[PDB]
């Protein structure tokens, strides 16, 4: 039943008595459901150390991964180029998923095409799909560049992208001069960040490999910046802002911030902004190239070093205080530009915030996950805040990365109770937050289900989620945030300390029971 | 817009295409004529998508894992192959259920075999057998396992049927191999059919020789309701108030036992024809169970459906039917009284999957709205046959619409509201056109039944009439 | 007792059994406490409509006010001038309070002096306090200007500031040409915002009244901006940023954003930034003067119109979409500068956010409070979002203001269930949120006690607080935020929608009970 | 620093002042000599502040309403006068209590008569009488009312005593007039005295003729503990483990009845001498109740205090004393073992109100720290007498320190940590000096007793040793 002036959606409609009774009858009649005592017994067991040991012995089963597949990253990379259509050679189901996944995170349109290979292409390969796909995409959507990646069907059947594109041009399906950079992006190798690396290196080679003769390192007096897989608009913006404030000439290579934030003014803009073809062509003439997220830009680094002859500096992601300082000092050395007064003051304002908030941050215990560079930067900043990052999970991390993080932990007493996990998923993390309970989780929206599980054990065992990472689907507009630089650190600090204080207020809100500590001033 | 204008709109839009695409797309666009009962005279459907044109379609794994199997709550569904497909589809579809997630129910979890290079090179059948044992250890209350094949499985020659039989025998467990690789078919559609045949072959016959079920004359199953935002629950309530007993829901909030009990019912009530007509025909052939199509969108269709369903039973059900209708009359009438004056005359364009593009038209009409264009991602001509009579004369029909076409048609038609999916939503909002998600219900619903109609009305109003839509133009431009 | 490895502060220490037993013994033995049943009965009664009626009949008692006293505002106004010491003539206890109040909100030093009048001054007045206080303050703290206000003792005994300052100069205690602008700021008239207006008008007069003969309206090609009482750093910043983007010459008159956000770099800076004396002296040469918060700048407006001859435009506070548009169009008209591409796109990004978030905001009901301009701008933006601002409380509001807000409510269907209250306090607001329960409160930290009270009635009656306003003492760094302009609107929208979604997640977190609606995507 | 260097420092700092202020301030600054017993040979205190110099002091209303009366939980305290004073002091001081706020307890609420011009012109006594009736209507479980006068009350000639007598008689209610206007005295201090005399005159004698309360030989009161962060609770627990009965706490978590019962006790235990010595002397004069000073900061002082208190009773209490000491020994020893090595040798400068600037020195010394400077806002010479023997030779003492002086002293002395108030905190942090609030405990505590020492140690360590302090200098110089 509904009352017309206070209509109920699913919550709380289905708590009406008539719906409750109906659901009970369905269960009892037809579902042959395990008894509630058995459900409770098994739940309790899944919270134990014994279960955790079994869980960590998994070799074949993955549950609730914290990674995606290569072509997702290729698509994001491609979106950062001016008037560029991401194009994934292979199966169309994949592209429906890539688009929707980003649509949900950015709350924006996400343009990408498929060439719709079907079962028939297993005989004969996907060459004809490429020919008609390229022609059709160019005519219909009028991109200035089509950036080609692959789905796993195309990789398994072994389609030679290079040969197919060349034949497409040979036979007149698209002009010889029309840019069609490409990369193989197998979903069964690495993760989405690998697809970003592969795509970027493919685009870099396309515009530079054959025209190296006339290039002189440093002749354009700019620094190239390669951001990697990045899903906070504030992160492209802060890096550009800081470099502009410092008077540093730069080229941000893959810059989707305009196309992922078009205005709602009565028109749809399929393309906006982005790195220009001229910038990619001229990139070898830079002083150097800086990699913002080096742990997933290894292939790009080899190309930049080996072909462009840039001496790529060994810099961590610019997250937290020390690593932002290092990034600025290196950029100052390369460019000859001094660090300006505005950035010095911004730094000191972050430090002020640290001094103001340190007493609530001190000793706070976190579980966290994400991509390798993001995770290591968050770990570093947590240590700078006097926090303990006790469970550090990077599903798509590697051994070399883990060694690097273990070293960062060793440089601080706040690292003493911390462990780094690679290859492990969110069902593994769920165990850790039961057996070695932290104060909070820092992670993406998939963490909400862990918080749910912990509250079911009891309010005293609940681990609240602080949403930082990708994807975030259950809050609005968090993709506008910043995590890099002093601005990002200021944002993360504020989010952390206020998460702490929100929880403290919840715990002290009980009239005559815990409100003795419900302080006006904190 | 007249027929000639719509015809000339189609021609204008198709001028952008190369010849081969133009000739194909012309066949998938039509101006409705409700005189027609053979849509194979007016539109082609269920063909491959043209490369490079930005179809909105998904794949057979979406149709099998995402649509049919995924909602079954007390089974574990393995996304078998590399990591992408299971991750993008994890909890994307709001197929609601009651359970203890991670313990007795598993719907919003992503179980995967996370194929690596060695699995592609040497095959994943050993991994799959090991994965099954790990599932049994860690999720002991699961009531069965399905194996949802992703693209590489068939391409590399794995034998998931052998693994399923051998492991199922060893563990006395229902383990269902589903060959729903995304290379198969042309869309979500073949995934439905594949999934239906997998239910038939591996689950549905389990209780064929079991007579213990306490059957009654009033036993029915809801076939093809995936309980989006609780839609099946707000349908079930009505059927049971009418005196029927809903033995099963396929597959929203569905359990493996209720699927196995379905061959014991007296009547299969089919909501989504496209997705579950296959198994419905199978049940009539094998068990003699009749099936009938129904529609629970809006009061006019819901009343008609209740009456048609009740007419299959006896006087006691027909009498309860009129009692139900009388009960809810003041409720939907009050919804109409409040919202119809806010929506009267407004024009809507729809683009959805296989059912809703025709099924929701009556609900719009109950609010005085007009559906001026509609179309489907993956419908067959039997769906278009059912559509031409529901749509007005000279309205626009589009099969497997391209992104370009959809934008251009909207620019000319200037609907007041669009109802489509997540990949469409933000495009049309930037154009200043109110948009409602007609898959996910924009995180609202239910929309089925009398209780759903109130929410549907609220929702179309809150969006179509929202103050934000008067603000797109800067006052200085 | 304590365990050295996990030391407990008051919460949860006093929940240990031995402390619980002790506290029970104290109560039973010595407190002669009302029985719990009687406490419960009275609590329930305080949530009723009968109680609300008695509550709203109060004429003499005020409980939990939502305003402060004049000199607080005078101090904030004064802090916005270069190398200026706020100086409150009267009783020193006042100044300890003004400083601490702002210290807690900004988490920054707040410099202000008293001249320490005592009871002895009731015979002869505070003239000698002024002479020695001015001399001492100038020598010790080296300000370039001393801006004088009053405490209520000085007002009651009738000290003539003008005469006292003049005599101080006559007798050589401070130099003749040293700037000592002043204003009478009685705590028993108006509120803190009135003190801001009084102080500003006194400073404006000091620098301009005697020098008007050489002034020509428009000759410096700038627009003066008067911010009023403002405690978000992002608000000073956004106005300066917008005007700069537009190429508009301006002078922000009273600009404390530097002195309220100095870096922690190893030195204390008593003064930083601020409006220069040169800016105040040249101000009558501007094209015009725009008042950001006109409802507490009425005295300033009379002076600017009557003496500077500026035709002050009738503009609302620039909050929300319409009023930010109006502000920019008026600034464009006055200055001759078009609204640039950057601001048009920013506007369109706000509108995009509104379209993305409208479904969760629609129909949401709010109680809210604050100063009059802030409150009316928040009401306007809530109507723009399709929200219902049902309880609108402005303790320091007036009848004319209330008529203006009632007219705003009449311009929208979303105003139909709203009432504006003036002269009412947070104990009145407490009744309203029990008897006509909204979804959320938007208010300052004193709101936390209302949320506490509502939860005590039951979880279903709890009204969560969303902290926007002044003071905010129980969260860190929210004073950095923005409420003005498109940036402010984006921030407010994001805060509101995510407050809604956080509460919905809490309500749907119950395993097998409400988690059917615990959606990953919203 | 040597004596001569500290004297030089004082002279150098005083150079900025005009002559009258210089001559005054020189009398309020001294270099400690622990041999000196008569501080009136060394330092002047409890004089007016010099105009314009940025004293840190408050007023008599702070001392009465904020400090003594405000914590009494089951009374309603009216801030009588204009709106400012009650608003700035609302919930600023963490005088903890157990109660149902708004119902039977009122501490964190702000009740005010919100004087307007008409009240100043014509007087507020009629307003006050009407306000009392409104309080009675809306807060019926209040157990008494105080009237905390703000500056204008006495200046305009209102007669709150008459209103209090008349209304108190009419309503059979204790209504206490308090003439704590901020123009009185020179600081918070006179507000304490005023407040003590108001307790004496209007509350404390209520049960002088009642013989119903059953006393025991072990009855005590905690006099002058305002329960900051729960400090009085972590004191009371120890007194009661020692076998005493704590009949009253003045005034943290205090009730009106426990104040009225205090004349029945055997011994008054005075923690804050400055604020409550007045009423303690009164109780000895009138009721014959002896009083003694004690100190619950840190294990050394707490053990000494427990022993000295137990020595006023019999052998059974002395035996329980030693049991308490033995129980807590391993707990505080573990605190010292963990934190003393992290803090050994570090130098602190304090500036606080009237007790803590000397009282916390032992707790610092229990962690190996050195208090190199200390001073008070509003202490009298009897407090300085108690301070000189607790401070080292040649340390710096400052009475009513100016902002300028405190900054300049810190720049020369370069303490490792500063302990002071909210108006000081942010100055010293920007200078790179770890700061702990020693009024509010930086929203931590308790610090009293054995359980408090653990928190105190944790807090000094977390702040002094925090990683933020190595980061103030940008690495590019
Ligand atoms: S049609 Fe899967 S998303 Fe793809 S590249 Fe392979 S992992 Fe990644 Fe359908 S079954 Fe899936 S979703 Fe595509 S792959 Fe095929
Ligand atoms: S010494 Fe009060 S803050 Fe003042 S100007 Fe009057 S309202 Fe405002 Fe002490 S009693 Fe109070 S706090 Fe001062 S006024 Fe006097
Ligand atoms: Cl889940
Ligand atoms: Cl309160
Ligand atoms: Fe958007
Ligand atoms: Fe600060």
Residue numbers in the entry:
A (entry chain D), C (entry chain B): 2 to 523
B (entry chain C), D (entry chain A): 4 to 480
Give passages from the manuscript.
The reduction of substrates by nitrogenase entails multiple cycles of association and dissociation between two component proteins for sequential transfer of electrons. In the transient complex, electrons are transferred from the [4Fe:4S]-cluster of the homodimeric Fe-protein to the MoFe-protein in a reaction requiring adenosine triphosphate (ATP) hydrolysis. The MoFe-protein, an (αβ)2 tetramer, contains two types of unique metal centers per catalytic αβ-unit: the P-cluster [8Fe:7S] and the FeMo-cofactor [7Fe:9S:C:Mo]-R-homocitrate.
Our previous study of CO inhibited Av1 found replacement of S2B by CO. Unexpectedly, Se was not expelled from the FeMo-cofactor but migrated to the other two belt positions with ca. 88% overall retention (Se occupancy: 10% (x2B; where x reflects a mixture of S and Se), 35% (x3A) and 44% (x5A)). This result augments our findings from acetylene turnover, namely that the catalytic state of the cofactor capable of interacting with CO is similar to that which reacts with substrates. Structure of Av1-Se-CO at a resolution of 1.53 Å, highlighting the Se2B replacement by CO and migration of Se to the remaining belt-S sites. The lability of the S2B position towards ligand exchange in non-resting states of the FeMo-cofactor highlights the likely role for the Fe2-Fe6 edge as a primary interaction site for substrates and inhibitors. Both CO and Se from SeCN-, with different chemical properties, are incorporated at this site.
